[PDB]
Enzyme design. Structure first.
Site, PDB file in Angstrom:
ATOM      1  N   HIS A 134       0.812  -1.213   0.000  1.00  0.00           N
ATOM      2  CA  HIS A 134       0.000   0.000   0.000  1.00  0.00           C
ATOM      3  C   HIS A 134       0.861   1.285   0.000  1.00  0.00           C
ATOM      4  O   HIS A 134       0.544   2.231  -0.758  1.00  0.00           O
ATOM      5  CB  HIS A 134      -0.977   0.004   1.216  1.00  0.00           C
ATOM      6  N   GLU A 135       1.903   1.359   0.875  1.00  0.00           N
ATOM      7  CA  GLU A 135       2.767   2.549   0.961  1.00  0.00           C
ATOM      8  C   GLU A 135       3.560   2.795  -0.341  1.00  0.00           C
ATOM      9  O   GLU A 135       3.651   3.932  -0.791  1.00  0.00           O
ATOM     10  CB  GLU A 135       3.746   2.483   2.173  1.00  0.00           C
ATOM     11  N   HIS A 188      -5.179   7.505  -2.768  1.00  0.00           N
ATOM     12  CA  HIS A 188      -6.087   6.487  -2.271  1.00  0.00           C
ATOM     13  C   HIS A 188      -7.211   6.269  -3.286  1.00  0.00           C
ATOM     14  O   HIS A 188      -7.568   7.180  -4.046  1.00  0.00           O
ATOM     15  CB  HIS A 188      -6.680   6.933  -0.947  1.00  0.00           C
ATOM     16  N   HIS A 194       1.971   4.815  -2.996  1.00  0.00           N
ATOM     17  CA  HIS A 194       2.072   6.276  -2.763  1.00  0.00           C
ATOM     18  C   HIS A 194       3.409   6.744  -3.219  1.00  0.00           C
ATOM     19  O   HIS A 194       3.545   7.844  -3.738  1.00  0.00           O
ATOM     20  CB  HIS A 194       1.951   6.632  -1.283  1.00  0.00           C
TER      21      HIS A 194
HETATM   22  C1  LIG Z   1      -2.669   9.352   8.221  1.00  0.00           C
HETATM   23  C2  LIG Z   1      -3.456   8.061   8.253  1.00  0.00           C
HETATM   24  C3  LIG Z   1      -4.896   8.310   8.643  1.00  0.00           C
HETATM   25  C4  LIG Z   1      -3.418   7.455   6.856  1.00  0.00           C
HETATM   26  C5  LIG Z   1      -2.394   6.307   6.589  1.00  0.00           C
HETATM   27  C6  LIG Z   1      -2.237   5.972   5.096  1.00  0.00           C
HETATM   28  O1  LIG Z   1      -3.228   5.608   4.414  1.00  0.00           O
HETATM   29  N1  LIG Z   1      -0.971   5.784   4.703  1.00  0.00           N
HETATM   30  O2  LIG Z   1      -0.705   5.188   3.482  1.00  0.00           O
HETATM   31  C7  LIG Z   1      -2.799   5.036   7.305  1.00  0.00           C
HETATM   32  O3  LIG Z   1      -1.996   4.447   8.030  1.00  0.00           O
HETATM   33  N2  LIG Z   1      -4.029   4.592   7.110  1.00  0.00           N
HETATM   34  C8  LIG Z   1      -4.442   3.384   7.802  1.00  0.00           C
HETATM   35  C9  LIG Z   1      -5.942   3.354   8.040  1.00  0.00           C
HETATM   36  C10 LIG Z   1      -6.373   2.128   8.848  1.00  0.00           C
HETATM   37  N3  LIG Z   1      -5.766   1.908  10.032  1.00  0.00           N
HETATM   38  O4  LIG Z   1      -7.268   1.408   8.426  1.00  0.00           O
HETATM   39  C11 LIG Z   1      -3.978   2.128   7.040  1.00  0.00           C
HETATM   40  O5  LIG Z   1      -4.295   0.995   7.435  1.00  0.00           O
HETATM   41  N4  LIG Z   1      -3.297   2.340   5.909  1.00  0.00           N
HETATM   42  C12 LIG Z   1      -2.735   1.266   5.100  1.00  0.00           C
HETATM   43  C13 LIG Z   1      -3.440   0.237   4.278  1.00  0.00           C
HETATM   44  C14 LIG Z   1      -4.666   0.541   3.635  1.00  0.00           C
HETATM   45  C15 LIG Z   1      -5.272  -0.349   2.756  1.00  0.00           C
HETATM   46  C16 LIG Z   1      -4.660  -1.585   2.521  1.00  0.00           C
HETATM   47  C17 LIG Z   1      -3.448  -1.894   3.162  1.00  0.00           C
HETATM   48  N5  LIG Z   1      -2.795  -3.009   2.904  1.00  0.00           N
HETATM   49  C18 LIG Z   1      -2.842  -1.003   4.044  1.00  0.00           C
HETATM   50 ZN   LIG Z   2      -2.447   5.327   2.216  1.00  0.00          ZN
END
Ligand SMILES: CC(C)C[C@H](C(=O)NO)C(=O)N[C@@H](CC(N)=O)C(=O)NCc1cccc(N)c1
Ligand SMILES: [Zn+2]
Ligand SMILES: [Ca+2]
Ligand SMILES: [Ca+2]
Ligand SMILES: [Zn+2]
Length: 158
Positions: A113-114, A123, A117
Site C-alpha cells: 500500500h505505501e 487512495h 504512494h
Molecule cells: C494518516 C493516516 C490516517 C493514513 C495512513 C495511510 O493511508 N498511509 O498510506 C494510514 O496508516 N491509514 C491506515 C488506516 C487504517 N488503520 O485502516 C492504514 O491501514 N493504511 C494502510 C493500508 C490501507 C489499505 C490496505 C493496506 N494493505 C494497508
Molecule cells: Zn495510504
C-alpha cells in the site's frame, strides 16, 4: 501527477522492527515491490547503505518530518510522493505489532500500500483496491495486484 522519470529505482531499509526476523522484513519489502514491478516498467534494486531513492524506516511518534505517528493502531504508516530527498520515502509506525500472518498488522500488505504512494498513486474509493484508505487482510501467498491498482500505475507509467 508526480512521477518518477527513471524506471530502475533503488531502495534502502534503514532499520528493522524487532517483531520479525531481518529476513522476513526484507522478504516482505521485496515482494511488495515485485507486485508493482509486474504491472509497470519499474525495476527496483536494494542497496545496503548509501543514498537510495526510497528510504524505508520504522519510526516512533515524532520522527523529524512534521507528521508524527500515533502509537498502536490508527495511522500505520505514510509515504511521500515521487521527488528528491524525502520524496518517495516510506515510514512505518514502529509501535505497531508487525506480522507475517493474518494477525493485525501484515507488513507485506501495508508496505504494498505505501509503495503505491511512493510511486505516485493516491487512495482509491474502490473497496477492493489495495489503495483503498483502510487496512483489510487478504490472502498473501500468491498475492496479486487488484485491477483498480493495475489501472492506477498503468495510467501513470506504462
Ligand atoms: C494518516 C493516516 C490516517 C493514513 C495512513 C495511510 O493511508 N498511509 O498510506 C494510514 O496508516 N491509514 C491506515 C488506516 C487504517 N488503520 O485502516 C492504514 O491501514 N493504511 C494502510 C493500508 C490501507 C489499505 C490496505 C493496506 N494493505 C494497508
Ligand atoms: Zn495510504
Ligand atoms: Ca499507529
Ligand atoms: Ca527519496
Ligand atoms: Zn514520517
Amino acid at each position: 501527477n508526480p512521477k518518477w522519470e527513471r524506471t530502475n529505482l533503488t531502495y534502502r531499509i534503514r532499520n528493522y522492527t524487532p517483531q520479525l526476523s531481518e529476513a522476513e522484513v526484507e522478504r516482505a519489502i521485496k515482494d511488495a515491490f515485485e507486485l508493482w514491478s509486474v504491472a509497470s516498467p519499474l525495476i527496483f534494486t536494494r542497496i545496503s547503505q548509501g543514498e537510495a531513492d526510497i528510504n524505508i524506516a520504522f519510526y516512533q511518534r515524532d520522527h523529524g518530518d512534521n507528521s508524527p505517528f500515533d502509537g498502536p493502531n490508527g495511522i500505520l504508516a505514510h509515504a511521500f510522493q515521487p521527488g528528491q530527498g524525502i520524496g518517495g520515502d516510506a515510514h512505518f509506525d514502529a509501535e505497531e505489532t508487525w506480522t507475517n500472518t493474518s494477525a493485525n498488522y501484515n507488513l507485506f500488505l501495508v508496505a504494498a500500500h505505501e509503495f503505491g504512494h511512493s510511486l505516485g498513486l493516491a487512495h482509491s474509493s474502490d473497496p477492493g483496491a489495495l489503495m483503498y484508505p483502510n487496512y483489510a487482510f487478504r490472502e498473501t501467498s500468491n498475492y496479486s495486484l487488484p485491477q483498480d491498482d493495475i489501472d492506477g500505475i498503468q495510467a501513470i507509467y506504462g
